[PDB]
Ligand binder design. Structure first.
Ligand SMILES: *[C@H](C)[C@H]1/C(=C/c2[nH]c(/C=C3N=C(/C=C4\NC(=O)C(CC)=C4C)C(C)=C\3CCC(=O)O)c(CCC(=O)O)c2C)NC(=O)[C@@H]1C
Ligand SMILES: *[C@H](C)[C@H]1/C(=C/c2[nH]c(/C=C3N=C(/C=C4\NC(=O)C(CC)=C4C)C(C)=C\3CCC(=O)O)c(CCC(=O)O)c2C)NC(=O)[C@@H]1C
Ligand SMILES: *[C@H](C)[C@H]1/C(=C/c2[nH]c(/C=C3N=C(/C=C4\NC(=O)C(CC)=C4C)C(C)=C\3CCC(=O)O)c(CCC(=O)O)c2C)NC(=O)[C@@H]1C
Ligand SMILES: *[C@H](C)[C@H]1/C(=C/c2[nH]c(/C=C3N=C(/C=C4\NC(=O)C(CC)=C4C)C(C)=C\3CCC(=O)O)c(CCC(=O)O)c2C)NC(=O)[C@@H]1C
Ligand SMILES: *[C@H](C)[C@H]1/C(=C/c2[nH]c(/C=C3N=C(/C=C4\NC(=O)C(CC)=C4C)C(C)=C\3CCC(=O)O)c(CCC(=O)O)c2C)NC(=O)[C@@H]1C
Ligand SMILES: *[C@H](C)[C@H]1/C(=C/c2[nH]c(/C=C3N=C(/C=C4\NC(=O)C(CC)=C4C)C(C)=C\3CCC(=O)O)c(CCC(=O)O)c2C)NC(=O)[C@@H]1C
Ligand SMILES: *[C@H](C)[C@H]1/C(=C/c2[nH]c(/C=C3N=C(/C=C4\NC(=O)C(CC)=C4C)C(C)=C\3CCC(=O)O)c(CCC(=O)O)c2C)NC(=O)[C@@H]1C
Ligand SMILES: *[C@H](C)[C@H]1/C(=C/c2[nH]c(/C=C3N=C(/C=C4\NC(=O)C(CC)=C4C)C(C)=C\3CCC(=O)O)c(CCC(=O)O)c2C)NC(=O)[C@@H]1C
Ligand SMILES: *[C@H](C)[C@H]1/C(=C/c2[nH]c(/C=C3N=C(/C=C4\NC(=O)C(CC)=C4C)C(C)=C\3CCC(=O)O)c(CCC(=O)O)c2C)NC(=O)[C@@H]1C
Ligand SMILES: *[C@H](C)[C@H]1/C(=C/c2[nH]c(/C=C3N=C(/C=C4\NC(=O)C(CC)=C4C)C(C)=C\3CCC(=O)O)c(CCC(=O)O)c2C)NC(=O)[C@@H]1C
Ligand SMILES: *[C@H](C)[C@H]1/C(=C/c2[nH]c(/C=C3N=C(/C=C4\NC(=O)C(CC)=C4C)C(C)=C\3CCC(=O)O)c(CCC(=O)O)c2C)NC(=O)[C@@H]1C
Ligand SMILES: *[C@H](C)[C@H]1/C(=C/c2[nH]c(/C=C3N=C(/C=C4\NC(=O)C(CC)=C4C)C(C)=C\3CCC(=O)O)c(CCC(=O)O)c2C)NC(=O)[C@@H]1C
Lengths: 203, 162, 172, 162, 172, 162, 162, 162, 172
């Protein structure tokens, strides 16, 4: 009958960390015969996740790509790959940043997690230098992790902040360094510019 | 800012490759055009006060009601804001001429333009009428390749407003 | 990942030398005791559900607070997470026992675990107590496997003990 | 194939944008270079038979062992394959000159080069020696901007082999 | 992607031959007319919004059906889609005019378009009429002197016409 | 480093599962092979000085030109680096025997091999000739399952160079 | 479209759950509001002809220039298109009242509105003036909860135009 | 089905790599264990009828209530389904012994077990009771490494039910 | 994936029966010959690069057309792709030989291959000829490994041959 002394509520930890909207992140799936209302939801979700809650002006919207998604010519997975290869992505996350910062940005944006070890950095830095940017971006989208979790119709969502099967222990603290909050973003447009949140020293 | 030079460098970096003759040829094209672009930029800068005042008056001639009371053209603050805005447009056009790309115009004016204009109830048609006035006067001032450069940057704005 | 053999090679490489006969002899001894090691790993895997259950029962009897309202193992969502964590730690201890080296335990399980718990507000000392309770159950199974040839397994039991102890010390 | 023209068009398409002055300036740079590049291409084409013969002989002089029996240089089929390969290199260089990009060289020669050369046990050093011989002879044939164009495409190959 | 130069190279490669002097001459002529070509491409880009608007106004006056309820350009979502399509086709025609080859138009814009329209229930003949209306407007702008040195641009105009015509024939 | 033991543990960890009889059977295979692998490793270590000397001499016999002046084989420093490299190969072969996987060879030698050899102009063929020399001499030293183990690790290197 | 019923079903489907009391309570809220919403819809339908006529005249009074020659208000075709557009707005408002959501308004009017208005140079302010006229007249016709429902859908349009 | 052999091949395929000595050593472990595993499998097959009969009776003794009317143990169909289910378990255990992995058990029994058992209200404790009875009888029949193999597959089931 | 053991179980399961003594006998024989099988798998992997190279040289001597301009093995990009394909097929045949079943070969390599080749325009009969040339080289290595104990490997050679033959028949 008597309560626990400490006595936090369930969700207290999430409340305290500010991960309460993403710890169990909602999953948005594009469904067949989707309404126009339904498609707009998916697009919003994509832009938020893939571009790191940075603002996209109406001039920057892709439009032709969305034409395909509405048609069914492409899947959510293909759409995500077009956005990641686009100059919208490249300008923010790639051109100003270093590779170290770019790689971890890609994990957060596309996989929804933090890099688990310095070997992931080593692999993706190596790919870029041998095969350039597009091959790199393809790796994340064409990976068992991507394919098993999201597959084709699910928009990527935040997987960190919950235990994933091959996760290292460093994975949850690293997601905390990557997450600024609901109002956070990963924006190039800052005083310091794009810097590495997750050092090599950390990995 | 998008310029010929930044764009070639960006492409090379994406491929992770040293710049090749393909990129350097493009770069050469920018540097050759620069003489005509500079000539345009100097002329627009020299006539900028007169260009702006005529541009603003043309908007008031085309839309007489603005000047009438209870309307956006009425009052000194409103009229001053007009001259400020057209001056911004000229400034970013001359910047684009010198930069060798539309990037200055794109980053300063084009991004967010539609949202800003909606919120403040600023009609794209007023700006377009001013730019068209400028285009006519520039045509008198410049000829040939200078003129071509000028006209292209003014046209870019007009299409973005449209 | 690292195992006992891999660790010896890495050391010799830094010296830039062929493995010495003494180093070879140590490795041969590991191979000689490998059947016992396999039996120990089997004992943990075969009794894994019982190990966790017995630990959990003891933990919640010792610390009534966790299961009371507001406790860290209350309600069902949290209780489920607690049981999941115990199973993960046991898994990694078993991995380390096959490897003969604690690195897999350190690199994947232990590093950042304490930080995670502190951020969550999970009580680290209780987590450590859970690992000690699991250790006692597990070691019992290793010490009394069924139908196995009678022998001295004490060195392997001590090695298992150290892996549990490392985990506890990291978490706390 | 990557050329100045295809690259600007591809960029515009990726952004889903009409071609603007930035792109057209790059395009102009290709068309200005074209006169020197065409002159280079004609000289390489006219002397291609002699260029290949000398290049192959240079390889045999630089590596005398190849000519000895049981070696890759020995025998008619092997020697014929040499002349064929050097001719390919020249042909794709002239194509790149006329195309206004390295794209012809990239698609036909550079892609897959390392894997193919490994499997067939073809040394990069033989090719490099032949290309350098050509570069010296071209230097006699061409001067100024034609020479600069020629040298760039020969150097691209040399670096890819290296 | 392919351009007129690249197309000639590909043909010569299949023959395994150095480009012929006649082939070279054709390419040299393309370089000679390149300034005029750049002017034409500029004219389309500079007047792009006007071209689409003028076409759209004419289309909806000609075919009241599309804008009525039950029409394909009703309601605003459909009308917006229609205007988007017109802009895309014009974009690709302009690309083709710079390239000097219709491939970019054919490979990206045109391929599968008729099938898509038929599935949607969009009337292909109306789409084709829109492309023809755009053509007449666009050709006028290239034809206008516009403070550009006066010359004969007839070949460029004819080439532009063919690209429009290809698009219309594919859709129809 | 890939070994039988690390690979079974990695599989289990990926699925997030306890090690089962499937894994333990695999592990038993590594520990049974170990006695033959150790015997091979001891023999390679005992004759490693002689194996290296003969291997280096074989390279010079197979490619006589190297020894001539201005060539990679010529000079003390060059010859010393040859002996160093072959020694490295032997060392990583013995390590792979003891580790129970190709992982030591893979991480130390095979990764980056092609890029290093290209930059320093080191021919894969010289190494292959040396490894083949060793393989013949090992065949004299070892028999049966030790010999089989040795041959597999030498073959792995030869294929990686190839 | 978006209605209370479709939205609760969509939520349940996303979580992959059967509809629970939470959803059914929401649904009951829609069915209770229906009586007020129907009354509003009938009143707007009865006066729709008069509402549109007055709304169009109001626009002409608020912006006298439009009626002058060479302007959008001038001519029968233009005036007819005005009456058509305002009538559409009323029709989609009554649909939204009956549907129990803004979904009919969203799918027919709001989606694509900005792009259409830009291309055809139709000012949002003319529509907003007409809607505000209707809102005043509706206020006379309806009272209480019917009036509240009506006002909300008219306001939704005004905000979307704004 | 997961077996030692399929798992090594799957790993190789994932890396896109040829099978190496690391994989072949694992494979050797499977083939050596096969002698003990076959002996276990033959013994379980020979005594399968007796093992099942005793297991079913043990469940009825351990939970006397089941046999009482209105309970799941009562009645011929129910008793028949019990014997069928225990027989399935034994069959998949012998399959796993022969296959050299837990894969047969995993694919046929373990996947979907919890959902099926919930829907049909089948207690894991009844199965666990039967398996433990079998384990005791097998212990009488087999000794040494055969016994160890048998025990591992019965234990896998017990943990999955637990 | 499937292996020889797994295949027998699946059959017995469909009958819903304990494996028959006859079925068991076949499996026992597979275990008895497993050492020879391991040697054969080793022979292919150890000589894999040579097998592909030797095949490639023979193929291009037989079919000069493929390497000329217009051929499917011209230019370097295509030649590289051809060599990649040969290596993939050999990999899967070696996997099948370890498994003792061709299913892995069929499901991962062979399924869809003919359709892919027809779309590409790759000549399937030449691909099949390449697989036959690889087979002759590979079988030679299996037949003559160095320092293996002398024995009859004929059944293993035949089994290898069938996997090569399956691949060839599927491709063409
Ligand atoms: C060579 C002169 C010296 C040297 C180099 C060296 N570097 C690494 C590892 C890395 N180097 C980088 C560098 C970059 N990151 C970037 O984003 C950029 C610019 C875009 C660069 C240049 C990175 C990311 C790594 C780490 C990841 C990786 O290894 O791929 C090493 C390897 C060290 C290790 O232990 O991993 C080395 C050796 N080292 C010397 O000794 C030279 C003097
Ligand atoms: C001139 C054609 C007409 C006119 C214009 C006018 N503008 C405003 C207000 C704003 N104008 C801008 C425009 C810009 N801000 C920028 O940063 C840039 C790019 C560099 C531009 C071109 C902005 C943002 C505002 C709104 C906020 C502000 O006050 O600065 C007004 C006042 C509208 C108001 O009530 O806020 C007016 C009237 N004036 C005329 O008389 C012409 C009709
Ligand atoms: C059980 C003995 C104790 C307990 C556990 C508990 N843990 C969590 C939450 C998490 N646990 C982990 C831990 C891991 N992640 C890893 O990477 C590893 C090994 C590599 C482990 C062991 C993680 C990441 C979480 C957060 C994600 C999640 O919740 O799934 C909780 C829940 C905390 C919350 O409020 O959500 C609990 C309760 N708590 C106790 O009371 C025991 C002492
Ligand atoms: C120590 C934890 C307890 C113990 C172990 C023990 N085991 C053996 C002997 C063997 N162990 C096995 C078992 C395996 N070999 C494998 O391949 C696998 C996985 C597939 C297992 C589980 C084998 C083969 C043997 C040898 C044959 C035999 O049955 O004797 C011993 C004897 C000494 C030795 O290992 O050589 C012992 C002591 N027994 C105890 O008393 C401890 C409590
Ligand atoms: C000349 C410096 C030396 C030499 C060369 C030689 N080359 C080959 C074989 C090939 N060379 C190529 C190269 C190309 N094929 C292409 O498609 C392109 C790009 C358009 C190139 C540059 C290829 C692919 C082959 C292999 C296939 C074939 O035979 O056609 C050989 C024979 C290689 C062999 O052993 O099979 C030789 C010898 N010959 C000399 O005398 C010089 C040392
Ligand atoms: C306007 C002249 C005519 C018209 C057009 C119209 N189009 C659609 C829908 C689509 N149109 C396209 C076409 C393209 N997508 C592309 O990416 C390209 C280039 C490769 C084109 C040209 C697509 C894919 C769609 C479907 C997806 C979408 O709706 O955006 C519509 C909408 C029809 C509907 O019911 O959804 C319309 C109305 N219709 C007319 O009546 C005009 C004659
Ligand atoms: C044909 C569509 C119409 C026409 C064209 C025309 N243009 C020129 C000359 C030039 N045009 C340009 C234009 C550009 N060069 C560039 O670099 C760019 C993009 C940055 C453009 C738009 C230039 C540089 C010239 C040369 C200088 C000059 O002004 O003469 C001519 C003259 C012939 C020529 O090819 O130079 C003509 C005929 N003329 C018409 O009347 C057509 C309606
Ligand atoms: C021997 C067959 C021939 C020869 C060899 C030689 N090697 C080098 C230089 C290097 N060799 C290596 C090789 C390794 N370094 C490593 O880290 C490893 C893995 C553990 C190996 C196998 C490297 C990296 C170098 C280059 C850098 C260095 O100097 O260490 C040279 C000199 C190369 C140069 O261009 O100066 C030589 C000559 N010498 C002979 O006589 C044979 C023909
Ligand atoms: C009335 C306030 C003013 C006016 C309006 C007017 N409208 C148009 C043209 C269009 N109106 C619409 C709007 C709709 N179409 C729909 O499908 C819907 C939703 C179901 C609406 C509300 C559209 C799309 C058009 C353009 C296409 C068409 O002609 O049908 C015009 C003509 C615009 C032109 O310049 O071509 C006018 C004038 N007329 C007046 O008198 C007021 C100033
Ligand atoms: C025996 C311990 C007790 C008992 C059992 C009993 N079982 C069922 C029904 C099912 N049993 C299974 C189990 C399996 N089906 C499979 O495919 C496999 C894996 C190969 C197993 C192990 C299934 C799925 C059923 C349900 C479908 C069916 O009816 O066939 C019943 C009847 C279920 C019911 O709800 O009526 C019973 C009673 N009977 C006893 O006496 C013991 C208590
Ligand atoms: C070599 C014997 C012959 C040859 C080969 C060749 N193949 C391609 C292209 C492809 N080949 C494949 C085949 C596979 N990919 C796989 O993953 C597998 C296993 C499932 C196989 C066997 C595929 C998918 C392609 C297409 C995409 C790609 O290139 O990777 C080519 C290139 C085709 C072209 O002309 O572009 C060639 C040349 N052709 C010959 O001449 C040989 C007889
Ligand atoms: C057939 C391809 C040729 C052949 C084979 C052959 N092999 C053996 C004997 C053995 N084969 C091995 C080899 C391995 N076992 C493993 O676990 C591994 C990977 C780690 C290998 C490569 C072993 C252990 C033996 C047994 C011991 C021995 O060395 O004799 C034989 C002998 C009889 C048998 O059935 O095992 C034979 C016949 N011999 C030929 O002549 C063919 C060309």
């Amino acid at each position: 009958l008597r309560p626990a002394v400490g006595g936090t509520a369930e969700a207290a930890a999430q409340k305290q960390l500010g991960i309460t909207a993403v710890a169990p992140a909602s999953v948005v799936e594009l469904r067949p015969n989707a309404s126009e209302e339904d498609l707009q939801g998916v697009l919003r979700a994509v832009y938020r996740q893939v571009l790191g809650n940075t603002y996209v002006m109406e001039s920057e919207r892709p439009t032709q790509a969305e034409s395909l998604l509405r048609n069914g010519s492409i899947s959510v997975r293909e759409f995500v790959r077009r956005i990641a290869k686009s100059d919208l992505y490249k300008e923010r996350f790639f051109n100003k940043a270093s590779n170290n910062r770019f790689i971890e940005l890609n994990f957060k944006h596309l996989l929804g997690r933090a890099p688990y070890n310095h070997g992931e950095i080593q692999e993706h830095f190596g790919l870029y230098h041998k095969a350039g940017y597009d091959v790199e971006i393809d790796s994340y989208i064409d990976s068992d992790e991507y394919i098993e979790t999201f597959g084709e119709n699910i928009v990527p969502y935040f997987r960190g902040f919950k235990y994933q099967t091959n996760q290292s222990a460093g994975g949850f603290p690293r997601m905390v360094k990557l997450w600024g909050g609901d109002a956070g973003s990963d924006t190039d447009r800052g005083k310091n510019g794009q810097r590495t949140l997750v050092t090599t020293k950390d990995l | 800012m998008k310029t010929v030079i930044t764009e070639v460098i960006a492409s090379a970096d994406s491929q992770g490759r040293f710049l090749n003759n393909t990129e350097l040829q493009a770069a050469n094209g920018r540097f050759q055009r620069a003489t005509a672009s500079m000539e345009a930029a100097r002329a627009l800068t020299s006539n900028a006060d007169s260009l702006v005042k005529g541009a603003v008056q043309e908007v008031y001639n085309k839309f007489p009601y603005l000047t009438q009371p209870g309307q956006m053209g009425y009052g000194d603050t409103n009229q001053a804001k007009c001259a400020r805005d057209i001056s911004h447009y000229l400034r970013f056009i001359t910047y684009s001429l010198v930069a060798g790309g539309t990037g200055p115009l794109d980053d300063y004016i084009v991004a967010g333009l539609r949202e800003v204009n909606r919120t403040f109830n600023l009609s794209p048609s007023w700006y377009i009428e001013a730019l068209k006035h400028i285009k006519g006067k520039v045509g008198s001032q410049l000829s040939g390749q200078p003129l071509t450069e000028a006209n292209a940057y003014i046209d870019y704005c007009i299409n973005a407003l449209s | 990942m690292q195992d006992a053999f891999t660790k010896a090679i890495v050391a010799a490489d830094l010296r830039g030398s062929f493995l010495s006969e003494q180093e070879l002899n140590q490795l041969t001894n590991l191979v000689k005791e490998s059947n016992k090691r396999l039996d120990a790993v089997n004992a943990i895997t075969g009794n894994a559900a019982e190990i966790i259950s017995d630990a959990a029962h003891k933990l919640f009897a010792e610390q009534t607070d966790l299961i009371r309202p507001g406790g860290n193992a209350y309600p069902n969502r949290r209780m489920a997470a607690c049981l999941r964590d115990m199973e993960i730690i046991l898994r990694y201890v078993s991995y380390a026992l096959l490897a003969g080296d604690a690195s897999v335990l350190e690199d994947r399980c232990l590093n950042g675990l304490k930080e995670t718990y502190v951020a969550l507000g999970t009580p680290t000392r209780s987590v450590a107590r859970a690992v000690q309770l699991m250790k006692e159950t597990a070691i019992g199974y290793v010490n009394s496997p069924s139908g196995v040839t009678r022998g001295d397994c004490s060195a392997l039991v001590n090695e298992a003990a150290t892996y549990f102890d490392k985990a506890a010390a990291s978490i706390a």
